Design a protein around this ligand. Structure first.
Ligand SMILES: CC(C)Cc1cc(C(=O)O)[nH]c(=O)n1
Ligand SMILES: CC(C)Cc1cc(C(=O)O)[nH]c(=O)n1
Ligand SMILES: CC(C)Cc1cc(C(=O)O)[nH]c(=O)n1
Ligand SMILES: CC(C)Cc1cc(C(=O)O)[nH]c(=O)n1
Lengths: 160, 160, 159, 160
């Protein structure tokens, strides 16, 4: 019985079986979720580079870390960006399957420094749901804001 | 004359002035010891969320429940987890002291589903002693395994 | 009451009794408590006493006053200040009851019980306040050069 | 089956059951590996002084820090320094065995500011192998230079 969940804290401080990193295409430390991921899991960044709209697993010991590269909407148009964001989440779902875990911590890709100024909560979350709906894992979504916790909560409740 | 004792029984039926819950950061029911604590004192889980390495007290009536959150060693390194386990027990001693109680019931934190498949009896117990040695409360340690009871009892005996 | 300070091991004091910076469970512990345990081990027989209290146990005829200051890691600043005053108050009572002319005393709650905070002034002010009620010579023991200078100044500006 | 591995990262974020500090015989914080170690485990430097060619374990909570003092080759002759470097690793092996740990994080001793201006990758690594081959522990070697990572990896693989 796979479920969707949402919790307001640092995604590094998680009690799920794996984590998705909001990564850049060069696999460098960056900022945001990527900083906290580089702090708690620096070993995961070895050969973590992968193109925009793709994902890549690097295990640090026993806990898998999936580097998902959403588009930077400063470089991408809204049209082309939307395709790449869908593509990134598609590979996250695959990696949650193709590896084969039971739970996953996942941030909303392209909703911070890659957002290009715009609020992309609903956009990113809908691409998250679309891709992850074909997986067996318990999904848990992370963020630093309470408004965002409530709006993600209502999103989850009104589809169940 | 403050003492340490060990009892092999359900901590939900303790004979002490407060109880430590082996809690998760989400203040959810959980499983095992955390489930039995939720069954006996359900209303103590209102706003009981507190991060790893901390303890938060919530009253069930006037009976204090100290929600102590040890690290999950599946998701923490040996180094970082050891530091957070020490911090969790330190905050338990803080809360026992704040409440003014003469006795406290306590489980061994990070020793079950949070142990990362490692025997952490000695690790958890030494952090417990280290924290609680500066308090004047009677401490009763609760376990379920008969062998663990023996090894905990021996550890208590060779301090005096 | 007189007041002095010396930078040396309190286990080698030259006073008629000693105050142990004790823990509530009567355990040998570390720091000043360990040194006290090495020189006067038999004074730790039933030496456990609650926070903010003192209990005298004789080693031969030499009284060891086990005073338990609060660990400021466990106590709030409010409750810890009250318990620190209570510990020193219990010491002064025992010094009066024993009838000693002198006493060796450390600064309670200033080391591993400090909660990462400088409590020289706090502990010393509770010391003065409690130990002014006796007429015994008080000798304070530390191991830091800085502490010795600060403790000296606080004695002189109250003469 | 115990392995040797190499990771190019800060040893202070290791995922092993204990760490070897590249130390000085004074027991002082220093620079390089020693600084990072001092920042993560400062209480392990309490009475950590140990002579050149020896190692000394100081606990930080329950996490062992093994202070190992390789020779400064600026001060030593090539033959005497070689003897002291080998001895230091021998003492590391003893501590690892005595602690009963399943794994250890270790730097290459005498290869930076103690190198005397020479490349001692092969010299130091072979003394490490000689000592640690008699232990049951997984060994993870930590370095910072990309090249050194490759050469250490090659050296590991051509033994198996
Ligand atoms: C290191 C980071 C700048 C890379 C990043 C940031 C976001 C974001 O803005 O949430 N999303 C993403 O897919 N990648
Ligand atoms: C709901 C529980 C899974 C949370 C928990 C379990 C232990 C334990 O394994 O004993 N410790 C702890 O601090 N917290
Ligand atoms: C065995 C010790 C940890 C007990 C102790 C330490 C201090 C202190 O930190 O000076 N004060 C005190 O009253 N008791
Ligand atoms: C504080 C540090 C200067 C001490 C040090 C440095 C090296 C080294 O050069 O890698 N090796 C060693 O055994 N000890």
């Amino acid at each position: 019985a796979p479920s969707y969940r949402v919790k307001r804290m640092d995604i590094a401080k998680n009690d799920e079986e794996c984590v998705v990193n909001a990564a850049n295409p060069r696999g460098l430390p960056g900022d945001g979720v990527c900083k906290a991921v580089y702090k708690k899991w620096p070993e995961s960044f070895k050969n973590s580079a992968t193109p925009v709209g793709t994902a890549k697993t690097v295990m640090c010991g026993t806990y898998p870390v999936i580097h998902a590269v959403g588009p930077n909407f400063s470089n991408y148009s809204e049209s082309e960006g939307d395709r790449e964001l869908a593509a990134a989440y598609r590979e996250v779902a695959k990696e949650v399957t193709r590896l084969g875990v039971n739970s996953v911590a996942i941030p909303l890709l392209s909703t911070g420094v890659y957002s290009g100024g715009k609020d992309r909560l609903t956009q990113s979350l809908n691409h998250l749901f679309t891709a992850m709906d074909s997986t067996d894992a318990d999904v848990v979504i992370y963020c630093r804001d309470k408004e965002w916790e409530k709006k993600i909560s209502e999103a989850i409740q009104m589809r169940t």
